[PDB]
Structure formats: C-alpha cells, structure tokens
RNA sequence: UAGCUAGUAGGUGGGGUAACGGCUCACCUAGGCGACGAUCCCUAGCUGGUCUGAGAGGAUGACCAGCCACACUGGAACUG
RNA sequence: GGCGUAAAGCGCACGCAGGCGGUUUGUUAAGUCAGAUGUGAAAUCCCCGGGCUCAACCUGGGAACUGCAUCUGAUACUGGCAAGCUUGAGUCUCGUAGAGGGGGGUAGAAUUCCAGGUGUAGCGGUGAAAUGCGUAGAGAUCUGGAGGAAUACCGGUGGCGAAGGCGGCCCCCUGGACGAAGACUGACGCUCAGGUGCGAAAGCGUGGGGAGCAAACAGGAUUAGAUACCCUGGUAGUCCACGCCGUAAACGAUGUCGACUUGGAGGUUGUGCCCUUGAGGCGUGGCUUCCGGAGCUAACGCGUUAAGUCGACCGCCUGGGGA
RNA sequence: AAUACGUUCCCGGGCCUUGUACACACCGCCCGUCACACCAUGGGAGUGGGUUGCAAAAGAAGUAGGUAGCUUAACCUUCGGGAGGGCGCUUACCACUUUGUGAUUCAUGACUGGGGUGAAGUCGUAACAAGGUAACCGUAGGGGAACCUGCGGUUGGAUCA
RNA sequence: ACUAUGGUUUUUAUU
RNA sequence: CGCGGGGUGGAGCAGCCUGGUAGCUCGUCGGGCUCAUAACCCGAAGGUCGUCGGUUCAAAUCCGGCCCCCGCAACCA
RNA sequence: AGGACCGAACCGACUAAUGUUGAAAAAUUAGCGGAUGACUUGUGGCUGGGGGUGAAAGGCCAAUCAAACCGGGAGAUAGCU
RNA sequence: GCUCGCCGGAAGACCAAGGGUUCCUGUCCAACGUUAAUCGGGGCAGGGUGAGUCGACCCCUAAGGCGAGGCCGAAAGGCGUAGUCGAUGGGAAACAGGUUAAUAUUCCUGUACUUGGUGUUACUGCGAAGGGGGGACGGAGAAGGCUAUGUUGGCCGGGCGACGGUUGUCCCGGUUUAAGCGUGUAGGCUGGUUUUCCAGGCAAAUCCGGAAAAUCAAGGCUGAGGCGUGAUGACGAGGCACUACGGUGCUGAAGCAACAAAUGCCCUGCUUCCAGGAAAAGCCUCUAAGCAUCAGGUAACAUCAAAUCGUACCCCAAACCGACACAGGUGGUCAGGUAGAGAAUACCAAGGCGCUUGAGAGAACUCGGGUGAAGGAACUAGGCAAAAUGGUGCCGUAACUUCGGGAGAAGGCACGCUGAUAUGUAGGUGAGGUCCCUCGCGGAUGGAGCUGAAAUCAGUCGAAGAUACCAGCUGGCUGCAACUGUUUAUUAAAAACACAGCACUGUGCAAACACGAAAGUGGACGUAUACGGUGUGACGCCUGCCCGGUGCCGGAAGGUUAAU
RNA sequence: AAUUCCUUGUCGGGUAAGUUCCGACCUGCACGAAUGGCGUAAUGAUGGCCAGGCUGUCUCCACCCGAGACUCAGUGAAAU
RNA sequence: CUUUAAUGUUUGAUGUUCUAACGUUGACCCGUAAUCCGGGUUGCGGACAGUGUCUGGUGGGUAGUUUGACUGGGGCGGUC
C-alpha cells in the first residue's frame, strides 16, 4: 500500500511512503545479524571513490543466504519481515533440523507453509528445484545468472522473470532491461516471485529526508570552480562545451560497456 | 437569495399590567429553524373596489368607502 | 395547449419522502353535498321609478353579489382506521440461445526486432514524379525465436443488453429475460423532487508500454500558394493496472406504468395440442422485421411493439442575433 | 479535291432523374479575420458617495433599587422634633454622539475580449452538386482569416457503399 | 492531373 | 573611433574581378487564352550604370572628387 | 507527533554603538536570527600541497594561500632605483 | 569587629584535566604588584602528599592503527592474514566519623567486600581460546511511587521588650547520622514441568534450536524507598577539667509529626512512533582438550596476597587556556521561596563579594541614560534611529490560499480585595470506629485531620487590577523568492548553492564508474522499482524550430594511410 | 521587465507637485520555453511603494543626572 | 595452362567445436574447526583478459614557451 502525509506544519505536504500491514516489523533473528561497517565512500588507497554519501541514522544488516551449500532439506517459512537494507523485504526459513536462514520475501507473504529442496521436490512454487526439472513458461525470481554462484539477476522488488525458451542444456529468459539472456539451467532460482513492487511510488517530499538515509548534498559541476569539475562556473549562464561527468564521460548517448567475455549468453538487447 | 436565531428552544419564584407573554429582575438547562425554500436585501402601506375581458386571468386602490403608520429629523416622559 | 421531426423526454438504470392505487364488509365524517343560523355593509353591475338642461349624477325599490363562517344530517367517493377477496405485484415448480458481466488459460496472418542464408537495382507509388530505404544488399524468398494491437471470413432479412455498447478458442463463477397448470402472502403494487448507481471516443492523473497507425513537426512533390490529397519519417494517443469526468448525431429523435383495437408476408423462443399418411401442421404467450385499414398530425407518416384511444407519476416548451 | 473506323472524350445545347444552404438564376449562393466610425454589455489598475452586519465608544434626561449630609407640607409631636420624601449623592438599564473591519449597490475609468450596425475595400475561397479535400458531433494538436489533421460515433452524405 | 474570381440595388396582380 | 559593402532604362539586383561589352525577373502600355480581370505566354518603349572628372584604343568596373545608403560599431586617458 | 510559534541552555549575526598602538592580530554592549534538527556538542581517529576538505568562497588547511609552513639549491635574477 | 550595600542558576558551590608549590612555616625588600606596601596567586630556605576497596592497571572491545608469513610499489610508502593494540564504550570490592599550621574514600576508628593463589577430610567429572543464553545500548511521549529537599507545627536551648504593640498575632538557635546488610514493599517484567529425539549451533554437546509423547497451575521475576541494621557508637547547643591548658579530651538537651517536592531514584522503566537502532568479556551454562584416589567440583575448616599508577594546591579560575596579576575562554556537576509551566523576568534564601592607584573637584563639552509644550515624517538616500506595541481567556475576524494556512488577522471586553455557598466543595492525601485472614513492608469497609482546584453569587477600593520587571506595532500595493537549510572567520547573508520534483542517458554484474606506477579496495554484502551522471528546480500552466559546425550513436563499399 | 541604449519612452492611477511606485503598450536594435518560459499562499533579518499608531527624525532645541574632561599625590609612557 | 576430387598440407582471418594453455570474480581437500590466498582435485569457462617492443590516430590530463619596433601617455587606422 502507499500513503501521502497531510500538509499540516511546514514540510509534510509532498511526503509519500510505502506501507504494508501483512508484513512484520521489529528486530532481526540475532544469529543472522551484523552491524556491517561503512566505507565512508573511500577506499584503502586514501581517496574518494563514491559520492552523495555520509551520516544517516542507525542501521544494521540482515544476512541473506544468497550462496547455498546444500540441497534436499525440508523447511517451513517461520517469519515474513520488513528489511531497511533492501526494497524486496525478507523471510525467515526454518529447516527441520533446527536451522534458520533468511531469503527474500515471496510475493504471497504467507507464513507457516512448507517448502522442499532438491530434484525430488514437487513442481510447486518456492521449492529448490533447479531449471533442468522445471517447465518452460514458469516464473522463477533471483534467477542465478550462473549456476552455483547463488542469488543474482532479477532479485530487486516487483521481479518475477519468466522462462521463455529452451536451447538444449540451457534456458532463456526475458528482462525488463530489454535483454534476453541464456543460462546454464543447473541454476536453482527461487521458483516463484518477490513482493513489494510499490517502491517507485515513494516521494521523499523534504530536503533533509535523505540526510538521515546516509546521503550528502552534491554541487553541480558548472556551479563549482573549473579546477574540480570539467564544467566549471563562469560568468552567468556560461557553458560552451559538450556535457560531461566529473571524470570527462559524455553524459548522454556515449557508451561504456567493454566486458567482451560472455557475449554468447546475451541473445537480444534493447528488445 | 443558504444560511437563520439567541428572551433563541423548553422549565422555576417574585415584581409590572385591566390582562397573555422571558412585559421585567433573578435561576435551571442547551438547544431551536431550513432546500417540502428557513432567512435577508430591493421595492412597496393595505382594503371596500376600479379598470379590462365572454370569463378565467391581468392591472390597480387618487377621487368615493374602511384600517394602519407618521407629525421639522431623531430621541424622553407625563396625562388617560 | 404541446414534447418523433416546427417550441420541448432534458444519455441510461435503481429508489426514500412526495404523489398515485384494484375489489368488498364495517367505521371516522376532515373534504364534499344537503339543511339551518349568521355573512357578502354604504356604494355598484343589471331592471324599473323619483329629482336636477338629455344623460351622467344624487336618490328610491327590485334583482344580484354564483362567494364566506358555524351547527346538525348523508357517506357515493377521496382521506383515515379496521378486516376480508385474489385478479395487480412479488415469491415458487423447470430450462435454452447469444459479442450480457467477471477471473484466468491461449493462437495465427501481417509487421518489427533478434540471428542468418539465396540473389542483385530496384523498392513503393501517381494524372505525372521526388524524398526515403538501397549495392555497405533495399525489395523478393526462406529457416529458428519473440513482442503487441486487433481478432480476417462468418459479418447480416443476426444475437445479447438499460444507454454507451458487447464478438474472437477453452474453463470456472455469474447478472437479467420468458411461459403453462398448480402452489403462497393477501393490494405486499406504480411512479418518484432529492438520493445511489453506469461511457462509444478524445483528454487529463499515478505508473508502464511502443509492433501497427498517427495528429504536431521535418523531407519531397503537385500548385498562384498547397498550410490538403500523394509520399519517406514521427511524438502524443491508441494498449494495460487503473483513476477522474460524466462527454456526443449518448440520433433507431419514441420518459416510466396501465388498457382497448385490424389484416398480411416472415423469423425466433416458450408453452399446449394434432384422425400429424407433411419431405410436418396448428393453437397461445414473449421477442420481432417490413407493408397495410381506422384515426391523429401542416406534412412525412405513426399504424396493436402507435404519433389512434385514455387513466397515474416526474421533468421540459412559449422567436432568432446576443447565450 | 480529300477525309469520315467510329462518338469512348472536351466545347456548346436538349430531355430525364438524384441532389439544390441556387433563383437578375454557377458571371448563382456563401465564411470570417484585417482597415474604420459608432452602440450596449463583460473584464478592469483604480476613483468614490449610498447603505448596512458584527464588536465597540457613549452616559443627558427617565425608571428600579439604594440614599450620607443638610433640610422640611399635609401624618405623629413632649411643639424640642419625629416618620417618609426633598436635595445631594449612588448601582443598574440609557437618546444622541464616535470608530474598526466586513458586506453590497449605483455611479465612474485608462485599456480591452466577444457582439450588432455602417464603409460593398484587402485577403483567400470554408459550407451548398460527389461543392473543386463528403459532411457533422465530442475532443486533442496545429492554425492570418475562413479552417485543417487525427480517434470514435452518426448520416443532417455519396460514386452499382 | 489542373483551371481562381464576379459588390449593393434593378419585374408582371388591370375594373 | 576605425573597417567592409551597395548606388546598373521605372523597381530590386546579376554583370565587373577574367576588357573586345549593356541585362534578368517584374513594371508600363498593346496583344494571345476569355464574357472578363488575375494565373500564364508574347509584343513594344527607356539606361547622365548616383554624379563631376581622371585613365586608356577601349567600360558601369580601372580610379580621385561631390553626395546617398547599410552592416560591424564607440569594446581608451 | 512535529526540517511548526514562544523561549532559558546552546547555536548564530540584521542594526546602532565600542574596540583595531584594543583587555584581545575577534573581543564588548543593547534590541537579538535560530533553538528534536538537513541541530549542536565533549572525546578520539582518518584525509596533505598543484593535494586534501568544502550544500564548493582563490573559502578552509593553526594570524599565512592565483599554491600555505620550514629548510636546501641561494650570495636566485634585475640593460633598473 | 560592627554596620551598610551589591550579586544570589550567580558575583553561590562540588570536581576531573592541565598547570606546577600556588598548601604550611620563616625572613627578604634588592627586583615584583599598571599606587603605598608593614601584605603575598612575589623572592628565597625548609615543611607537607600514606590506598585490598577510590579513578587508573589486569580482562574485553569500537572507529582506527600496528602487522610475522604473504602481496603491490624504481623507491619513499602502502595493503593485509595469523595475530595485537585501543576510548569517547563494556568489565570485581567504599563509605565516612576522628582531626593538624598544612594530610587521610589512603592514616586513625568502624562497617562493608571482591579477585588470584596454597591445602586437608568425605563424596565426586571437571572445563576452553569453542557453542548457546545474556550483556545490549533509536528518539520522543505520559501516569504512578519515592528521597536528601520545601514550609509550618511540636520539642529542647534562649528572648519577653527604651521604641505603636509584642504571654494566644509571638521570635530566634538547634532538631543530624553514609556505603551497605536483612526484610522483600511502591513502580516495572512474566508460562513452566517431566520424558525421548534427526543431517542444525561450519568440530563436540546432556545447554540452545527444532520434532513428538506427557503433564501442572497461580505461581515465576526485578526492586526505589520505609523499618530493622550499620549505630547503646557517631553528631549535638549547653556543661567541665588539667600538666608549660603550651590542646585534648571528658561530658551532653531536643533529636519528632504534618503535608507538598526534583533535574536525582524506581528508569535504558512503561508507553509511543519511526529513519529500526556497537560488539566482546566478565557471569550463567553445554561440550571439545587433558588427567586421575592429580587438578577441578560439592560440603565442612584452616590459610597466603592484593602488587602496578596517581593523590598537596587550583577550578569558570590574577594556580588551567589567552605571551600579561589580560574587557575573554576552558571538560563534568548542582539549583529552595513568592508570582509563573519557569535553567522567563522580579526580589531574595544558602552563600559570597564591595570588583587591585587613591584624594580633590564639579566648567562649557564628550561618552551614555531619563523627561518634554504644540505640530508630526514635513526630515532622511532610507520612519534610519528613537518612541510606542508587548500577557491570558472570551467576543470577533477579510483579500488571497498548495484548503494545512492567512489568524494571537484586524477590532475590542474582562482581569484587585473581602464575604458566601462548602466560613475549603471536587481530585489527591489521611487517623480512628467497624470487618476479615495464611498472617503482615496485611487487607476490606471507612474517612476526624492535611493539601486544595474549579464555578457563581454578595460586598468593598484607587487615576490605574496583564498595576512594577520580562513579553507582538498594525494594515495595504508590487517585484523577487517555494517552506526549513548553506556561505566569502573582519565590507555581500542573498534571488546564488543545496533541495522535493523532472528529462535525457550510461550500466547485465567479475556492472558502469572512482582511487591509482598496481594490486587490493570503494560501487555493494547492493543486482535493472539496483547503481552511475548531467542540468533544471518543490506545487499548478506547460515546454516550438535549425543536424550547417562540433561531438556522440550507427554504418561499412570506394579513396588517402603506418609498422611490416 | 533585476532586460529598453535614446528614453523621467507615452499614458491612466497614486501626491499640491511622483526620474521611483502601481497598470498598460507590443516599438523585445538584444526575454523565451529544464542555460527552462508562464504563475500563486503561509513565508524571508529580501529591494521599492501607500497609510495609520507612536515619535526631539524634523521645526527651535531646553532641563535633569553617572563616567570622563579640570587639579592634585604615587607610578609614569610614545610615534616625532 | 585452366579448375578439382581424394590423399598429404603451410597460413592469417572469419565461424563453431575441442582443451593441455589460462582463469575461477564456483565447489571440494588441507593450511585453519584462520574475514589474506598458497598448493592440490574437480565443475564451468576457454587460446582471451593482461602486458612489452614497433606503429597510425587522438590527446590540456601534463609540461615548456611567446603575443617584434614606432604610435609627440595608451589605442583604432598608418609606418618598417
């Protein structure tokens, strides 16, 4: 759900939040908690490597088991929880052996319902049944771009991803990025969907409300002195150049992809 | 014309009057009215009747019959 | 007095007060009418006198002033309060066709993109021609894959629906209509100011999406010019999760209910029958196309699904320019 | 002298039917901007009375209750004064008179939208015939005017739709 | 294909 | 400031630079198409080539004067 | 509840006055601007010169900056005073 | 010394740091002191600083550093594992009577108490560096309890009147006693028990975690403060004695009730919202290791140590910091009446101070306050300055608005003292009578006494009841600007920058991008509703053309063309 | 117009009189649609403009009063 | 001498495939019941990344340098 604030007292007028009563809010399961230390937007080489960073209110990290080490174990989803670290929210998995792990919160938000692991598992949602066993046309989430490498590709909020085609010992899926991509089909994925999908409807409303979120204000390149950014202030309304980043890259149209290692996995782009 | 009261809405004991009344001083409560047109401004006294027409309807009240209001303009008491 | 079209039913469904309401035995007697007691003065309108030049007028008598106030009577009928009655109405027994509604599943032509081959100056189009795509391989042709709108033909003497409308294939859920012999309440009904509900489109709003087509704008032509048609492109929009609006030729110009009447050609759907020598026929309801008799309208025509006939309820009309 | 298959299609005519927003009859009819002298209304920086709501200024006389001090008509009286009024004071209610912000109406105004009339002009030629791009309705984007281009609806259209 | 335009006013009714 | 152009039968500009030499599209009048004017196709008349001179065999051009115009422009005590 | 209004602590400077051989190479008064916040503050750490840090001023980097502070090259160089 | 006066959240007072004898005693005046100077936060010589418990060390750790082996970098230098350090964070024991010129949670005197070691007897599995539990930590909001405290009463000690009066109108002095223990109370928290058990707790587990069978209730926890107790001692006004009284003891009164009360204590509580909020160790407990009439454990009893650092004096201050005996600054901390919500503003308590040349003078004038006739913004670049306004509730309140605001709009009315109803009522609090039980930091009923709102009526008073201080001037036209933020330390305080919002675009993850000799980092423990960047500036109207230049995206035939 | 050279453009309104202020022009030698153009409220230590309240700002300045000026005694400078 | 099958085959590319090179930004084994990454085995990629010599292009990121003399002060035009 999504809510706007009432314009009572100055500054509240434009503030829009995402809200959900079907999802729990509180403290995390302590054996999967760490404080996760800040870099400050600086590295071990003594210079700034990031921008728009600093300060903010107190926050910890909820440890999600993206890279898995075993299969076959029966489980139940014990909790469905909010997570400040990710737009996708979090769910607590309780395995029959007395073991707990975190996963991304499934679209159904349902607690106390069983899920099975391994190639013996039923063709049912949320089971740890790898793509070699699944029908084409199924929805997967957190699709595991390369097998054994764990949860990456299509794992942020509102994602589902559908398996479109088969190509021998591989399967091909379609992305909202205009890309259609082939994967080695031993990939596990989450055999389902992820929730939220409302996070782009938020409106920050205030000029200070990013500050408590660890964000710092950043000056326009043509407003600072010519010694720090290739733009550089004038002279009123000067520019007289092609627009660039603080490091000389043309801000529009100019491309920067240079990988050239894995082109055979990418079937279509800008589709 | 979509707002209107507030002695208004419903009770209590004296005082005032020929006499009803929140007439009038106290005290006991918080409503009452209205689109099914409350209420307020603009204009205007009203009527026996007169004028019109086949009548309905419309217009109109001087002059001849009958009330009200008003007395430089505003305001206070007496007399009865 | 009018509301199909001159002037008007206010785009379409539900519905409280308001207003309306079958048939019968009681009962109240407000309304009504009856009867009586008061009133409608003086004038005045009308008829006939008196008196002042005629007459007016001022006066005398009649006749009027069809009205109004009350107290009794009657209760046909409206209101009101009891009580029946089964016909209106609603409920029920049984089911069908179709684009009626809702949620999901799904596919192809053409096109474009993805990935490639066969092959060479054309493509595409006009009265005639460019631009553009095009030799760097455009068009043609074909293999594999995928997207999206709209769902070709059927398709119209057709269905379903309150209007707008709604079609494509399958499944689940689901609204409303219609009839015969009986059952049930026993006037429970009709309409309805306000009230509560519903877009073909275009637009806007929050967020997506871009094949097809295309306002705007560019390129080239035609031409006086061409702000148009032609033609190479193309945004918004169309599509979707939806929201707001209430928009129109929402025009098949018929507000909603009730009832009587004259024929035919034709189709469908119930329901009941047939001495069914039929490859079917006939009653009787609902829908329903097109001619046609009466009657209404200036005229077209309406024509039993009325613009004939006639009760109940709610809105609208009274020159145009200007609005 | 020659040419004539044969009337497909122009010019100019006739009859017939369908349209007609035509009728000195297509040399018909017809739209609006611009030029310009006017008239009324709307909008309006403003200029200003009329009038009034609410909250408030105000305290003359009057009425109601108090009422020192000083006094004195009628009653009482020991003839000294006593009683109540007077006077002079007081607590209420209080005629005028004085503002603050609202509301509303009539006057009035630079400049001005749209509308009707006069100047028959300038501009193109938008609707009526199949009206030279079928028309129209809603609604966006454009547009010197008149319009034009799209999506859906509908014929107040039309060529064997 | 393309080929536009034409002010206002200006007739018949017998006794 | 200083710089660079234009002045061409009536209008507005090609021409010039490259010397063997006066024009185009309109305009004016008269035709052709027509009932007629436009659109359109033809016919006809007229250049101090701003204008005074210079120079040469020879021009509007080479080139000085006397005027008329525009563009950049006043960016220094 | 509060990137609201009052306001002491704290933070900060709109005006007038004082001070710049002044108590002081930024302190003072009287009216103050803010004051649960994009706040402010105690403490430590990390970032360094053609580099840092900056809601980014040739500002800040210990009185210092169109390259600070210290030393070396250095007894720089000066058609001139 | 007495008196007068000023400050009184400070001009009172407690304490670290950091400074460095400033604390004590003497004599030196030469120098010092913005003046004498006999004095000393001066010069100089000597005196004084005691710890099981304090605060620190040990233990543990953040940010971060240090870093063998290992790695990058001509090099300087950097990275980083095993490990190791480290505060502004977490952990064992402390309070205060005695007092000397100067010393004391340290000695003296009491009481409290923790950690490490040695060892016997009896019985006996103990135990990590690992695992679990806990430690444990967002910011506000709102009741209750409580106490040093407040203010009277009583009591003991004293006063009773030169003065208007002071034996029912009294006044002053005093009325005190820790940490901690025991009881286990306000306030606050809340399911256990008995049994078996799987691939988890990257090894082990009897403890967690999870699965099943069984079974029980009304108990399980935390504890401010009271009381006892620490303490028949201490403290105590008053009384008394003796050797050089040259100090140093002896003695000793009252020692209590009422109500209100914190910022402190219950409390990091509870409640509440949100941006979702350190870890480890001690401690409890499970097991791994290792070992055995050892060590450990359980019970009884003896017993050795508490080492390591600091301690005087200062303290918002002429002992710190500002070169100064400096218009100033400096880390922690407390806070009563009377009015008021007062770390507002006024006067004062407790308490301190009269501000480091002094004395004449008393002139226009200057620095700065107070008052002003009549007129008023006429002045001035500028109502600039000055002056006025200034509180609460009720009555009342427009244009414009993003419908929240504008608005405490504007304009005005009220605002003392006494009496009364209830001469003090409602809430809170509080002693009996009555009533009940295991019992007791006892409950039920009850409400004399204490504290005391809220409202109305009746009298009385001045010029004036927000009486003083402190505390908005008001409205209207326009531009600009969203509102809150940021700034050129000393000429700009803003319309700039930031910023909600927006377009265009790059980025498929070993992302793009950034640091940079190059690794390893940062992006991100993020993965296309995720991240990068530019500019414009929230919200509403919206937002056209030119592809010639130059760049970018894309394209490959033809031509120029290097190494070779 | 925070843009207009020449411009007090020219004009209405605001004053007795207005280079500014308020509302226009369409003549922008030269604004202009994210180097964004168009626009409004609370509001800002924001420029201008109109009025009242209060006022020694101004008219004409007056009186009152600390601390300094003056004179001592101590200590006792300096730029020049 | 044409063009070429089958057999033999040098070579730079294009395009697949294979894999010992190389990688792991996977797993496993052990260091280590180590938050470095060393070795080993496997899975999956795969002849490349990366880097040095030659070389074309571009290259303010970075360096070094100048803009003559006269102009009756400086300048526009003029002058050498």
UniProtKB/Swiss-Prot annotation:
PROSITE patterns tied to this protein? RIBOSOMAL_L2
GO biological processes = cytoplasmic translation; negative regulation of DNA-templated DNA replication initiation; ribosomal large subunit assembly
Kindly state which keywords UniProt assigns to this record, in alphabetical order: Acetylation, Ribonucleoprotein, Ribosomal protein, RNA-binding, rRNA-binding
Q: Which miscellaneous remark does the UniProt record hold?
A: This protein can be partially replaced in vivo by its H.marismortui (HmaL2) or human (L8, from the 60S cytoplasmic ribosome) homolog.
Per its UniProt record, what PANTHER family does this chain match? LARGE RIBOSOMAL SUBUNIT PROTEIN UL2M, RIBOSOMAL PROTEIN L2
**Assembly information from the UniProt record:** Part of the 50S ribosomal subunit. Forms a bridge to the 30S subunit in the 70S ribosome, contacting the 16S rRNA. Interacts weakly with S6 in one of the 3.5 A resolved structures. In pull-down experiments interacts with CedA.
Q: What is this protein called?
A: Large ribosomal subunit protein uL2
Q: Which organism is it from?
A: Escherichia coli (strain K12)
Q: What is the lineage of its organism?
A: Bacteria, Pseudomonadati, Pseudomonadota, Gammaproteobacteria, Enterobacterales
Q: Name the encoding gene, please.
A: rplB
């Amino acid at each position: 759900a999504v809510v706007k604030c009432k314009p009572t007292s100055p500054g509240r007028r434009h503030v829009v939040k995402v809200v959900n009563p079907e999802l729990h809010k509180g403290k995390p399961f302590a054996p999967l908690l760490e404080k996760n230390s800040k870099s400050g937007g600086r590295n071990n080489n003594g210079r700034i490597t990031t921008r728009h960073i600093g300060g903010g209110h107190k926050q910890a990290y909820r440890i999600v088991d993206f890279k898995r080490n075993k299969d076959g174990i029966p489980a139940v989803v014990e909790r469905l929880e909010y997570d400040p670290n990710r737009s996708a929210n979090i769910a607590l998995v309780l395995y029959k052996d007395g073991e707990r792990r975190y996963i991304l919160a499934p679209k159904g938000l349902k607690a106390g319902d069983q899920i099975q692991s391994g190639v013996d598992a039923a063709i049912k949602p949320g089971n740890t049944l790898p793509m070699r066993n699944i029908p084409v046309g199924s929805t997967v989430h957190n699709v595991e771009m390369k097998p054994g490498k764990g949860g990456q590709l299509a794992r942020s909020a509102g994602t589902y991803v559908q398996i479109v085609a088969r190509d021998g010992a591989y399967v091909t899926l379609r992305l909202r990025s205009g890309e259609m991509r082939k994967v080695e089909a031993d990939c596990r994925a989450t055999l389902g969907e992820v929730g939220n999908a409302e996070h782009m409807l938020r409106v920050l409303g205030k000029a200070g409300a990013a500050r408590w979120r660890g964000v710092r204000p950043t000056v326009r390149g043509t407003a600072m002195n010519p010694v720090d950014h290739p733009h550089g202030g004038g002279e009123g309304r000067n520019f007289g150049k092609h627009p660039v980043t603080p490091w000389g890259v043309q801000t529009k149209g100019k491309k920067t992809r240079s990988n050239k290692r894995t082109d055979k996995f990418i079937v279509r782009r800008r589709s």
